[PDB]
Amino acid sequence: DRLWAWEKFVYLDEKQHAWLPLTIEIKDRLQLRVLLRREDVVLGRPMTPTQIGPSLLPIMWQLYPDGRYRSSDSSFWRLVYHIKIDGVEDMLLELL
Amino acid sequence: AVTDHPDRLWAWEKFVYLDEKQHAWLPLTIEIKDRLQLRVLLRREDVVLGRPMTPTQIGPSLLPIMWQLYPDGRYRSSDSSFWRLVYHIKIDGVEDMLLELLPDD
Amino acid sequence: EAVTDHPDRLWAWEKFVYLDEKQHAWLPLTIEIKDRLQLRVLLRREDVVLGRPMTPTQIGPSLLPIMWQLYPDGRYRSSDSSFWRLVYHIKIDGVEDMLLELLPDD
Amino acid sequence: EAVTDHPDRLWAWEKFVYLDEKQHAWLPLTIEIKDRLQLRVLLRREDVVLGRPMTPTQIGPSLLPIMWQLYPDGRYRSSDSSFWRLVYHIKIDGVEDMLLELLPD
Amino acid sequence: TSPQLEWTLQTLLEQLNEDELKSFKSLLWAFPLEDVLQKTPWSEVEEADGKKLAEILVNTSSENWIRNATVNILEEMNLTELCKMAKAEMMIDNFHDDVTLRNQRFIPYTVVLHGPAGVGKTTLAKKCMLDWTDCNLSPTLRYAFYLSCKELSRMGPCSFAELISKDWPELQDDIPSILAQAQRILFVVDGLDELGDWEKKKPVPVLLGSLLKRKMLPRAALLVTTRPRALRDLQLLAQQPIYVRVEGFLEEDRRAYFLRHFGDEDQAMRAFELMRSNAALFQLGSAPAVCWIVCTTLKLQMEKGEDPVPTCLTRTGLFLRFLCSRFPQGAQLRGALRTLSLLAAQGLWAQMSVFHREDLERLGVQESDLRLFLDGDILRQDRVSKGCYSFIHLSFQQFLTALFYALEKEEGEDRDGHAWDIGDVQKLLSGEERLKNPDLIQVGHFLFGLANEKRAKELEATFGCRMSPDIKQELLQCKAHLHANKPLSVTDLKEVLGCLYESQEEELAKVVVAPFKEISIHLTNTSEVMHCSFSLKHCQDLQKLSLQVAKGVFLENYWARQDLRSLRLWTDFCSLFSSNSNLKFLEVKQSFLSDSSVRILCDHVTRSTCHLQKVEIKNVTPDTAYRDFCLAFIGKKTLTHLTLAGHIEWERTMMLMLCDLLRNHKCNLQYLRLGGHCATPEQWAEFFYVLKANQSLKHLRLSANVLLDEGAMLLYKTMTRPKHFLQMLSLENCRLTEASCKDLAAVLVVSKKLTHLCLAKNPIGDTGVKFLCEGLSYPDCKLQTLVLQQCSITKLGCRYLSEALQEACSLTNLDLSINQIARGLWILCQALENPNCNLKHLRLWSCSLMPFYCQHLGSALLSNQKLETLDLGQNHLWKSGIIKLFGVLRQRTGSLKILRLKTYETNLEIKKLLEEVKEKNPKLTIDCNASGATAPPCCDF
Amino acid sequence: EGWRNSMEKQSLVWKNTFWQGDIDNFHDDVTLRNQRFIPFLNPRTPRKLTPYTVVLHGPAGVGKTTLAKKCMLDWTDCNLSPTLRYAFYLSCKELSRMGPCSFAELISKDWPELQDDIPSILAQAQRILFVVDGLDELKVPPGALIQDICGDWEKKKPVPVLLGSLLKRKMLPRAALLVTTRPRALRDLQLLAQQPIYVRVEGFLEEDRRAYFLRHFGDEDQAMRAFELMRSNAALFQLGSAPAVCWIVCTTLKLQMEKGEDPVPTCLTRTGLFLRFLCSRFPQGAQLRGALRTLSLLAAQGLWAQMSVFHREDLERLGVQESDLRLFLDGDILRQDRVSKGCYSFIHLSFQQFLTALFYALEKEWDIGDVQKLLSGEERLKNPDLIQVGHFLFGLANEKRAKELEATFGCRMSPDIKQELLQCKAHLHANKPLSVTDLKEVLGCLYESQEEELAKVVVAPFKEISIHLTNTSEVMHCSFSLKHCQDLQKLSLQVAKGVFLWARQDLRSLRLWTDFCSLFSSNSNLKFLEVKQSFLSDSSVRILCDHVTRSTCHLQKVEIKNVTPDTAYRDFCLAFIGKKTLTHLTLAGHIEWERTMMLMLCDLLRNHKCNLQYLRLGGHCATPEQWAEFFYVLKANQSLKHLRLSANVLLDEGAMLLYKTMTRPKHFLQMLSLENCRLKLTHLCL
């Protein structure tokens, strides 16, 4: 439903299960690809936005109709696929 | 296996770098394992040239604006961190380059 | 509507695509021939995307020159050593237009 | 009115003057361009005195070819192996006119 | 330091034209150089002009060396006239205070002040003395004494104590006590040029010489004021002095003075602008008196509602108007004007600046006329020492001197009771008199200015005198100064053009500028442009021209009106190219131009009345100039040469133009050079592709351009085709290695049109030499020339060259230098011994050879049959090698015609051997002066 | 004719006009080079009635007597002319001893046969040539040359009177005079001579040294190797303008190379070279201790009284035995002058200085001062020739050299030399720009010593230094010495043109620069740096930046002025991002703003790790857009407090943007200045 950034490259969902970005792929100026994996990792203090510094990925994601995601910056993303391997969930998104 | 490494790299357009000889380099993918494990693979490809977008237009990004090579084979970026070269090989005319981030002490 | 400003150059980025000194694009529309020694060419302004710059070998032979340039007295010198005269340059419906002629060789 | 006849072949005799097998003088009056693959030229038949044949070297490079050929199915062959199409061939008030076109590969 | 020697050396050199100056530098270099000079970079010497070259010599070399170096060089070059000249000489308040405050700070100590007249040295000294009196200075100065040559030149012998106490009788009782404290005394000598026991009576000159020599009161402080003319004696008199220079008003102070005098801002600024429009009159405005004259004249004209523009056009008009406006109307004082002219002439000839009542009496000047002479401000009475008089300023004295010469001379005036110290026109215009008395140069310009007719008419109408009509012919009788039969140096041309502009009569200019054949110009400000435009339009046989523009003429790229005036004058000036149809060579170098000026120049160059045949561009800014010039020179029917150099980067537009310049069908080019052009391999590839179509180019130079060897390989792979047309080719200093030599060998073996080559300044290496030699061996090789100057080759390369030459090749010319062949020299000697050799020339300049190896060369020369020229230089075979070579070559009369080597002609035995060889081989010319340090270039090859 | 025939026999000795053993007489070119500047040897010279005086002056060992001999020989030949030709030569060495007599008797002492005709020859004054040689070796009371000047040549007067007459030209005014001297005695001639002409003698130049090397060695490879060795040491190179020094170096290196030993160490320092020379001029096991003591004492005596030529009586006064004289002569220590019998002298000046120093070091058991007197500044100024003895004394302080000398000659070295040197330590402190030259001297002395303990103790208390490099040797000295400083707090650096410009030379220069730059990283307390008016290269600049960027440097205030090439400003600006300790930064120079430099400035002011508290610029040119972006980025900075944009081209739009920025509340600057732009907040100026 929603993803909140708790640590750099760490995201907590509506159920507060950590999602760890793994890779960021660029094909064209309008093609930005990022993969997400859900794995429980020891969490630290909430890195306030200033501590995080500049970053390409947004701070927040929220579910949008039509298989799309709206980011904190008002940008929109599309969900390509989502599977479960050996108990670990995977989510892949592409920029719009 | 390329022995002559580039001397400079400037950000001309979002995700496009020009080298000392003005050949457009493109970063293919960014692989991150954790805060201390970051590496980027660069490839050489001739792409159409637009207008030079100003820093305000490029916007915030993970990568540094420009690179620079110091003796002892290390790369220093404008953000004050040191990048170590991993490999640089040529296959059928296409050149691949991978750079690693050294966590500054 | 008459215009009091003129372009000081016209490179040939692509065949039938000219860019003035402010990187605006001009496109030729039609070519007029009245006789052997009279040729009048019509230029129009329009904004279009630009591809890769075709090199001189790719451009090939053509009737128009590769580069104009303004000279005092209000005459253009093409790249083939011939002088071109300015006929008129007006604005209509917000669209820029220009007409040029080929003067007899001195 | 439209005329079925048409020159089989055309050859350039001078600068901006052509001759057909009948040796009628066909001249270009205007050229209309919409893009590289879309190019149009207009022809008219007039009576004029022919000078010495200006050999192609003196004519110099030009957008028009040195020879124009005609084939069935609206197929025209030029000296440079390009193809052209005929749009209309009419006679009005005693003047005969013809229009050509350029077809993308 | 001695300012005298620098001034004397500068003036002589500026009389040399371009051709002579180049020889002078070369001859000087061959001269035995002091160790300090050699450290200087030879590049700087070449670029230095006449004035700077003098500065370089004086700041590094001993005085005696300079004197003998100059005289010997000129005598050898056969400039006899200059040799005689060289030998003779070589044998209102709040402003003056502002200047003096900064001047004073630049200062037993010996101080000398020197500067041009009217700059205010006496005010500076008096300000220092007043500061001493007012306790402003340090308290250490307890006593100071004032001595003036203006007065002391007449008083008879006496004692120094009495001399200095003459003006202060009360102090004589304290003179011994004062002089017991010599360390607290300050002495000032004012106006030197106008010229042991303090209680011992002696002549005034003896006392002054002793004090200047510090023979009396040695531990006092001295301060001297003099003009640069009389600075010579102080060198022989003073011991370890220090020199200080004064300058006077500046632009800001001139503006302030104008504001003070006029009062009204509008009037003051209008007048200041009108004055500054004239550079020559502006420079003379530093002296306050000149500004006084200008302000008075312009204000008087303005109050009367008259146009001031013609007044400031030239000096003579201004001074003439002022003089006309300083005497009563209707008097027609012919006699007074003649008297004043004669008095000024006498004063100028005798070099005296002050006159006493007795001097005025001697010339019959009635004291009644002094009322008009003074109240009109022509003469100024000194208020300190009564009975003295002087002229308002030096320039006014010079103007009156000119008025004397142009004034009509009466019959029998040689019968006067005095032998006047007046020369004649020819003596006045002579150069030796100019050097002896530098104050007649300005009289020359003024005299030229008075040759007009309108000014003579106005002067006669206002005063009623009579004017001599023979001046127009007398000036041209010294026309030999102009008919030197050689191009005039820059300074001489400036002087002649300035005088002609002063004349303001075209009929005077035509007869003088008719025979010019070559010209060089160096613009520095607007006035020079205006003068050149006015004068040179009448030339018809002009054939060459070299141009140059200094910074500041054209305003930086962005005031609009200031640049507009310059643009208008530039457009007027650029009509020489269009009108003159005999001009056949141009050159432009080191100019700070601007886009508009370049566009105007090209517009005038593109017309059909111009018949240029060669062109050159070097180090021009901005960087659009090269592109515009390449555009303008397309289709020129006559053009057959073209050069471009500088620092450029190949923008795509430049690539377009530089390819179209060769694609065209009207092209008639025959030689093309490029320099400092950086570009990517793709641009070079397309350029070399375009070359394939050209059917006129024959030469091609690429000096200083970067090929990176990739352009080179592309070029060679282009030349292997069977239909190329280039014949010469030169890749001087293009970052080459041995990698590309294989393709060069392929070109040599396959080509059928290539017949020259050059690779100077490239460490290609012995492997590259080996590849080329493998190339040469093929039977069908047609290359006839080859140059490998300074290519870092070793004895292995020499062995390869000899092995290649051993066969029946077609090579005839070969040039080696810098790179050394000493150890392998015997190998090349063996190669020469081979009957199959066909070499005709061979250069071994600076090859580090030892005398032991002269045997091989001697035997080879005695054996060979086809060699016709050999060049040896910078070798150590000077004495023993000379002996052995001359002894060996005495045996046979070989075909050799020209042999070059360095010798000393002071040895009798060497002279005898040379005479014997010459007698037995009269057809052999031997160059004994190979000491020249300039290498044979690649221009011929 | 008959007189010339007798003279021709004497011409044989003067015909030894080349260095003893010269290969092919190289001195011919050197002598004949300077003959163009002598007036009375130029027939072209105007034949006036004014008689001339020619004064030759040049440092010691440059061989002027040889040029005078050549002039005499040329005059004797005398290409047929109506005037007669006679030549005579007087040396000041024997004038200081002769008693009163007439000029005719004075000049006939060495020509008894012509004595009766001497008056006639004197009568024909025009045909006479006079050579007065060795004016620095004249021993007379003060002012004795201006007393009772005599005009008649046959009137008997004291010798100083005769000299004062002849030089001042009161007697025989029509003859030609040639006076030779060293620069020390150039003041008397300014008074005595009337209308003098000065000629300078300079001896071998670089190419002449190369030719001498090639002729001596014979083989090109060894000759060039030895020449490069010599050219490594600039200070020892300068002494190569005298032929004798070059002969010494060539003999030493050739002998070393012949036996196969390593020659590189020998040319590393002057004292080592001379010690190696000295150790090989006597047969082994000769027990010459007394001889060495006497020789050292004699050298000291000579240098103290300012006497360079000793007679047999002077050597007698020290008890030197004829054997000792033979051993010195055969060993090439003393040279017996050929012309005037009874005169000797040392092979050169420098060898005399070195031998004098050996007297100071040697252990004890005449008019010679103490060490404090020797190092006193007043004595140095009075007698400049004592300076080199200081460097030689320092060099001899090493323990290894002392041990070598002890094993060789069995002598004993005084252990108090180190302490005596250190006692004078107080004299060196200058701590001001004057320290430049004094610092050079101290560094030279220490580098000569080669012992790290002495340097450690000497350079401990320095606080401020200035450096002015002019050649590689200076860089080597600084690197060797300064590394031990620990209380340094300020450093000003300047490099002269010519240090950086052959691949081997460039490699050596880069290696030495890399060694030199290690000061910044190793030393921590250093806090202030400055560079001005330097000629660098890309590699050196990059190395300097790499060393500055390390984590030990704690700089706070940095200034750059007039550096070349122009890329240096860009590199330095890049390398200074994130150095927290940095607070002040200045840049000055003439350069156009490239897009890259604009990016670097924007980033430097944008970084969140920046802590700058001041910034000043100058001499920068850019378009309004670049200035607009610069000022837009500056809004994001919250640390900078002071700014100054004096002397920059700027643009009207940029100035307007700056004016808007000043009044804008968001901007955190406190003082601003836009001086010379083509014209929190407390201060403002436009």
Side-chain angles (χ1 to χ4, degrees), chain F residues 22 96 147 187 231 249 280 356 494 532:
Chain F
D22 191 3
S96 69
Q147 295 171 2
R187 199 43 41 81
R231 190 170 70 136
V249 168
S280 80
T356 279
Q494 171 166 358
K532 56 192 175 207

Side-chain angles (χ1 to χ4, degrees), chain E residues 798 801-802 814 816 821 824-833:
Chain E
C798 305
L801 284 179
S802 265
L814 161 63
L816 305 164
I821 66 142
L825 188 134
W826 145 77
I827 318 172
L828 281 153
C829 287
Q830 195 288 331
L832 288 174
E833 154 170 31

Side-chain angles (χ1 to χ4, degrees), chain F residues 373-387:
Chain F
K373 194 179 173 189
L374 184 145
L375 275 150
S376 77
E378 195 176 335
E379 217 49 50
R380 285 171 151 210
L381 201 43
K382 189 224 277 207
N383 198 3
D385 294 336
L386 284 147
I387 293 162

Side-chain angles (χ1 to χ4, degrees), chain E residues 401-464:
Chain E
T401 299
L403 200 74
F404 162 66
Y405 280 104
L407 242 184
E408 190 191 48
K409 300 186 177 187
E410 204 221 8
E411 306 165 339
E413 267 187 300
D414 300 315
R415 307 166 181 166
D416 286 346
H418 299 271
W420 309 122
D421 303 66
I422 70 195
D424 216 17
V425 180
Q426 276 110 311
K427 344 301 181 183
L428 187 149
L429 291 158
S430 71
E432 65 277 33
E433 207 69 37
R434 286 183 154 204
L435 208 155
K436 194 172 162 70
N437 191 348
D439 296 321
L440 299 164
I441 291 176
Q442 187 63 35
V443 182
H445 299 353
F446 281 129
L447 179 57
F448 252 99
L450 277 163
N452 186 304
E453 290 287 339
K454 172 173 295 315
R455 285 163 191 153
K457 152 65 92 164
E458 181 173 358
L459 190 87
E460 288 197 341
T462 308
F463 287 128

